[PDB]
Design a protein around this ligand. Sequence first.
Ligand SMILES: [Mg+2]
Length: 692
Amino acid sequence: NPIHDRTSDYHKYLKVKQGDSDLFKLTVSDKRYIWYNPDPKERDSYECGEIVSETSDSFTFKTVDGQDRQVKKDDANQRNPIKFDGVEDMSELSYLNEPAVFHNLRVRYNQDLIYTYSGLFLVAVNPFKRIPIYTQEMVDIFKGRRRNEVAPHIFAISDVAYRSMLDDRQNQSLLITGESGAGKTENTKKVIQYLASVAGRNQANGSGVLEQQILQANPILEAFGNAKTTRNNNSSRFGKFIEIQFNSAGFISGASIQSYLLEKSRVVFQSETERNYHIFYQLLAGATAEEKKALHLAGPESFNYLNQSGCVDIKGVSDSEEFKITRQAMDIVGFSQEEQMSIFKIIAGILHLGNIKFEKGAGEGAVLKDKTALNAASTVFGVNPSVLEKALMEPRILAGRDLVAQHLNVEKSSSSRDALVKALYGRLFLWLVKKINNVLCQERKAYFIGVLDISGFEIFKVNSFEQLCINYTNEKLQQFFNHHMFKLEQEEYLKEKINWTFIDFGLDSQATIDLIDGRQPPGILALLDEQSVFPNATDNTLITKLHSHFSKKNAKYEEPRFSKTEFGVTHYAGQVMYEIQDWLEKNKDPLQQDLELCFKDSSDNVVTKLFNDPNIASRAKKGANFITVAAQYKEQLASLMATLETTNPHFVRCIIPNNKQLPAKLEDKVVLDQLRCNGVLEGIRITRKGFP
Ligand SMILES: [Mg+2]
C-alpha cells in the first residue's frame, strides 16, 4: 500500500514531511502563543508572540522585538498547538481564526501541499509550478478510497462525488470557485481525467475512444477560448459547464459541453501586454509555408488584431507546438481535414478583415483605397469582394418600408467590420462546441457529474460589460455556496427541530445580485435593456439613468465623484468601477444584414453553416426586437443555476497565492482577502458547530 509506504511518491508529494527530534521538542512544549499584528494598520501581517501571563479577561504576550502587549481574550487570535501545523482538514483546528487558518495553509504550501480540506469542501492554493501528483499512479491510489483515508486531493473529492452518485443514485456537481488565475481550469481538467480513468471502459475498443475524446475536447476549446490577460497567461475567456455522463452501471456513457459568454471583443481589441486568442498565434506560427501561402498569412506584427498590445509571445509557451496539439486533438475528436482547413480559413479571414483601412472620402462617407486586405479575406472566405465592400460601407436598411442604402463614415465602417469579425468568431466557437457535442453525445445518460469551470472574478484598469457579466456570474456562484452551506443547512435543523439556534454567518450577496439582475424594481441589466431598445438612447443617457435609480439609494452602488462615465458595484470580492462606453451596442450586439447576406453566399462549407444554421445564425426575438445579450445571458445562467440545484454539489475553493503568477510566494494580504470573501472560516464553523 503506497499509502502506508513512507517511501512512495504518495507520501513524498502528498504527505507532510516527518518532523525531527528538535521539532518534537517544540511540539511537546507547554508554552502558549498568539497571532498578532506588529502594525495595527496592517491587519493581515501577523507575527507569532508568546503568551507570558493572563488575567480573567486578557492575555499579555511578548512581541518579537521584545515589547509586551495586552489584548482581551475576546479579541485574541490564539495560535494552535504546532502539532496542528500541516493538518489535512482544518476543521480539526482547536482555534479557528484568520491567522491560524492562513498559517496552516502556509505550512502545507511551503512543502508543495496545495490541497487542504476545510470541513466539507476542498481548498487549492495555486502553486504556479508543476508537482507530480496527477499521474495514473496517483489516480489509482485514490480509487475507492475514503476522504479521511487519503490525503487531500482533487482526485479525492472527484472520487467522493462518484461514489455518492452510485450510492445515492443522484446527479452530482463539482463547483470550482476562484478569481482569475486561481487554478479553476487546471483542477477542472483533473476532475475529468480522474472521472474518465476510474469510470472509463476497460476491455477492448471503445475504452477511451470516448474517454480519450472527452479528454481531447478541452485543448480544442482552450486554443479558441483562452488568451493571455494581465492576470493569467491562459485565461478562460468563456465559461463552461461540462456534463460527464454515466450509465446505471457507473460507466461513462458520454459528456456534454455547455459554453457561456465568450469574450468576442478580444478578437478585435486587446489591452496592453495581453494577447488575442491563442489560436491566432498558433496558426501563424504553426502553419506550413504552403498553408501560409494559401491563407496569405504573415507575421503577427503584420496584423492589426495582433500588433496592438505589444505582446505576441507567452513565456514558456510555444505556439507552433500548441498548434500541433490543437490539430491532433481535432483529429481525435473527428474534425475532417476539409473542416480543419475551413476553420483556419476563418481564422486567417478574420485577420485580413482587421487589416482593412477605411478612409474618409470626398464626402463624410467612407472609401476603401487599398483593396488588398479586402480581397485576401474575400479570397479565403469564399465571398465576393465588391459585395463585401458594399455591405461594409454602404449597408442597406429599412426606413419605414423604404429600402435606403447607407454610407457609413470611417468610424462606423470600422465598427461594422468589427461586428462581422466578432460574429464570425463567436459563431465558429459555437460551431466547434456543437460538433464536439455530437461526437460525445451517443447515448442517453442515467446520471451525470457536472463540472463548472467559469471565467473567474477579474478587475482591470478598464472594466466593461464583459467584466460585469463575469463578476456577476462569480457573485452568483459564491451565493450558491452561501445558500447551500449556511441557509439550506440551518433550514433543516430548524425544520427537523433539533434545538437548534439560528446563526447568521454574515455572508449574503443577494443585494449585489439584485442590483444587477433585478426585475422589479429594475436592476442594472434591466435598465440597460430598456435604454437598449430606446431609439434616442446613448451611453450618456444610460449612466445618467443608472445613477438616477441607484446613486445614494443602493448600498452596493456608487456614483463616483471623479468620473461621469463610470459606476461602482460592490461585489463579494471587492468594489469594481465599470466604464459605460459602448454598453448599448455591446448589449444590442448588432450586425448589418447585408453583411450576413454576403456570407450566406460563401462557397466554404463551414462558413455557409455559420450563416445558414438557425441554431448558429438565428436570434430569438423579444417581440419587436431581438433578445439582448443581457437578457439572453441572464436566461442561460438561471437555467444553469436551476440545474445545479438538482445536484449534490461539491465545492473546490481555488486560491491565488499572489498577483504575479509566481511560485513559492504566498502573500498574506492576497490570500486572506480571498479566504474572507470566499467564506472559508465560516464554512469551517458551520461544519464544526453543526450536524452534517
Ligand atoms: Mg480558466
